[PDB]
Symmetry: D2
Subunit: 232 residues, 4 copies
C-alpha cells in the first residue's frame, strides 16, 4: 500500500475506528486512526483556513484550523518524517463523503518546502482552472467551477453527492528530506468551504504527503477520507 502522512479535518465521528465523539482535526501517520486529535468547531457554509507546519529541527507536525472571529483548533505530534516518508514525495488534498455528505471545496492552496545547508519549492493557487496541468486530479476531483477545486462530486443543482472520493496532487515530486540537509522545512495553507444540506456533514478534507505514485485506495469513500485502504 501507499505511505501516507496527513492532517485530517474530520467532520464526522466514526467512534468504531477510534474517532472522538465530535468533529476533530488529527495527525494521521500511516493510519486513519489519528496519533493525535483536537476538537474542531466546524462551521457549516463558512470559509475556513488550515495551516500545516513541520521542520527537521523540532520534528513536530503541527496544524491550525480557523474561521474568522472564532477560536482556532490546533494539533501537534512529535514524529521524525525521515523514518516515515520516502525522500521524494507528492503533496496533495483529499476528501470524501459516505452515507452523509458535504461540499469539499478548496478555494486556495499554497505549499513551500526548503532544504538548507538552499533548495526551495513554492506553489500558490488562488484560482483553479478547467485544465490545470500542474495538478494531478484523482477520483471525483474537478477544477474550474467558480475557479475552485471541488474534491468530491457536486451535482448540477449544487448539492454534494454521497459515497464520493477525490484528491489533487501537485505535479512535481517534492524532496521532503535529505541526509546531508542541516535544516528541512515545509508549510501548507489551504482555504475550504464545507457545506451540507443534511443535519450531519461527512466525511472531511485532508492535506497529505505520500509516495510519488500514490493513488486513491479502492473503496476509501466515507471514513477512510480517500487516504487508507482500511481502518487499521
Amino acid at each position: 500500500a501507499d505511505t501516507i502522512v496527513a492532517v485530517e479535518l474530520d467532520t464526522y465521528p466514526n467512534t468504531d475506528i477510534g474517532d472522538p465523539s465530535y468533529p476533530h482535526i488529527g495527525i494521521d501517520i500511516k493510519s486513519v486512526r489519528s496519533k493525535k486529535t483536537a476538537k474542531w468547531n466546524m462551521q457549516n457554509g463558512k470559509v475556513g483556513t488550515a495551516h500545516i507546519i513541520y521542520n527537521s529541527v523540532d520534528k513536530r507536525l503541527s496544524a491550525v484550523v480557523s474561521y474568522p472571529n472564532a477560536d482556532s483548533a490546533t494539533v501537534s505530534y512529535d514524529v521524525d518524517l525521515d523514518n516515515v516518508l520516502p525522500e521524494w514525495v507528492r503533496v496533495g488534498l483529499s476528501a470524501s463523503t459516505g452515507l452523509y455528505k458535504e461540499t469539499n471545496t478548496i478555494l486556495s492552496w499554497s505549499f513551500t518546502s526548503k532544504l538548507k545547508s538552499t533548495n526551495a519549492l513554492h506553489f500558490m493557487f488562488n484560482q483553479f482552472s478547467k485544465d490545470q496541468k500542474d495538478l494531478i486530479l484523482q477520483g471525483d476531483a474537478t477544477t474550474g467551477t467558480d475557479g475552485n477545486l471541488e474534491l468530491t462530486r457536486v451535482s448540477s443543482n449544487g448539492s454534494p453527492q454521497g459515497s464520493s472520493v477525490g484528491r489533487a496532487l501537485f505535479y512535481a515530486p517534492v524532496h521532503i528530506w535529505e541526509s546531508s540537509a542541516v535544516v528541512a522545512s515545509f508549510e501548507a495553507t489551504f482555504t475550504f468551504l464545507i457545506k451540507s444540506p443534511d443535519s450531519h456533514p461527512a466525511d472531511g478534507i485532508a492535506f497529505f504527503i505520500s509516495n510519488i505514485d500514490s493513488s486513491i485506495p479502492s473503496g476509501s469513500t466515507g471514513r477512510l477520507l480517500g487516504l487508507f485502504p482500511d481502518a487499521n
Copy 2:
C-alpha cells in the same frame, strides 16, 4: 515540431545560420536564427550568471549575462509570448557540443512565474542530486557530480566531449499566460561554468520554454543547441 522560446549563450559562431562572428547571447523565437543578439565576452573556466526576465505589461524578453568584475552583456526583444507559446509550458536548460566542445556545467538554477489578479510557482536549485525527481533529464544531461548539473558529457577527470546534447526540464508544467490575468511575469537565473581545452569552445547553453511534451530534436548536437530540428 516543438515550439521553442530561448535565450542562447552561443559560444561558437556558425556564420551560415546568421550567428555574428563572435560569441554572443541571443533571443530565439521558434528559430536558431536569433531575432536579436549581443556580443558576449565568454570567460573560459570562469563561473558566469544569466538572468532572464519577461512581463505581460512590457511584453519584452530580456537577458543579462555577467562574470564577476567584468561588464555584462544584455539583449532584449519585444515579443508577445501569448501569441508564440501555448498557455502551459515546461521550462528548461539545454546545451550541446559538436566538432568543438566545452563543459556545460550548471551550478544553480532558479525560476519564478506569477499570474496576477495571484497564482505563483518558484523553484531554486543550489544543489543538484544524483536522482533528482523534480527534473526531467534528456540526452546526455546528468546530476550529482559535485552537486552540479552537467548538461553535456564530461569524462571522470572533467574533460568535455564532442557530439553531445543534453537538457534538464522542471517536472511541473508552468502556466505561462492566461487570457484573464492582469499581469503575468517570469524570471530565471542560472550560474554556469563553460571550460574548453580548444582554441574555440562550442556550442553553448540556452534557457528555454517549450510545449510540455518537448524532447531533444533528432540530430540537434552542435549549432542547434538541443532546441531546433534544423537551422530554418
Copy 3:
C-alpha cells in the same frame, strides 16, 4: 525640495496643469505634469488594484490599474531612475482631496526590491493596525479603521472630507539602485477603494519613491496629491 517619482491614480482633471479631460493614470518624474498618462475608468465605490513594476535592464516604469471584470488601464515611460532618484529612498502611498473629495482607502500594500549580482527587501500589509510602527504616517493618514489605511480624512459614518492630504511611508530606507548591481528590480501592488457622494470625485492616490527625508509639501492638498510643492 524633495525628489519624487510617482504613479498617480488621478480622479480629477486639472486642465491648467496638463491633466487630460478624464480620470487618468500617470507617470510623474519630479513634476505633477505627468510625463505619460492613460485614460482610467475609475469605478466609484469599487475595490481596485494597482501594480507598478521597474527593472534596470529595460529602464521602463510601468503600471496597470484594474477592477474585477473590467478592462485594465496601463501606462509606461522609459526613464533611467539611476539618474533621477538618490541611491537610497523611501517608498510610500499619498492621497489628497481639495474642493471635491473621495475616500482614499488602502486595503492592502506590498513592495519588493532586489539588487542582483542578491540584496532583497519585501513587505506585505493585508491588515493595517492602529499603532503600526513600520509605517511613517504623514498629514491626515490614519490606520486601524476596519484594518484599512485611510490616507485622507473620513468621518465616523465613512464620509470623505475636502481639503485633506495624507501619506504612509515604509519605515526602512530602500536601496533602489547600486552602480555595481547587474540587475535591480522593484514591484509594488496596492488595493484601494475610492468612493464619493460628489458628481466629481477628487483628487487621487499615488504610489511614490522619494528622498528618505521626504515630507508632505506645504499646501499640497487637491491637485498636487501630497507630492509636489507647486504645479511646475
Copy 4:
C-alpha cells in the same frame, strides 16, 4: 533596561556566570545565563551558518549552527515570546571581545517574519555597503570592508581588537506577535567568520530581538556579548 531574547554563539567559557566549560550555543531569555545550551565545535577561520526559527503554534525557539562537512550543533527552548517581548521589536546581530578577541565578521544575514489569519517582512543582505541606511550600527560595528559587516573592531593590518562591542539592527520595527494572529513565525539565517590569532578566541556573536529603542548596555564588552548590563 532593555528586553532581550537572543541566540548566542559563545566562543569563550565564563564558568563564573554559568557558561559550560566549552564553546557553546545558547538561548538567552532576558539573561546572559542561557536557559539552554549545546556544545559547539567552533572552527577558527572557517565560514559558519546559523539558522534560528520560532512559530506561535509550537512556541519553541530553536537554532542550528553548522560548518561545511561537520556535524551541526542545535539548541531549543520552549518559551512563549508573547509573554517576554513587546508586540513591536527590532532584530539585530551583536558581538563582543574582552581580554581575548576574535573577528566577528558577518558575511550574510536574512530574516523573515509573518503574521497570518497575512502580514510579512523579509530582508536579505548578501552584500553590506559603506553607508547602509537600512541598518542601525551601534558601538564598533562597521559595514563595507570586503562587503562584510564587522561587528567588532578590526585594525588596519586585519587583527581583531580586545574590549570591543558592536551591533547592527534592521531599521524597520518588526511586528513579532499580535493577539488576533492565528499563526506568527520568524526565521533568521546568518553566515559568520570568527578568526583569532590567539590560542583562545572570545567572546562570540548573537542574533537578538529587543525593544525597538534598544542600545548597547554600557560596559557590555567581553562575556556580556553587547546584550546585557550585568551577568545576572
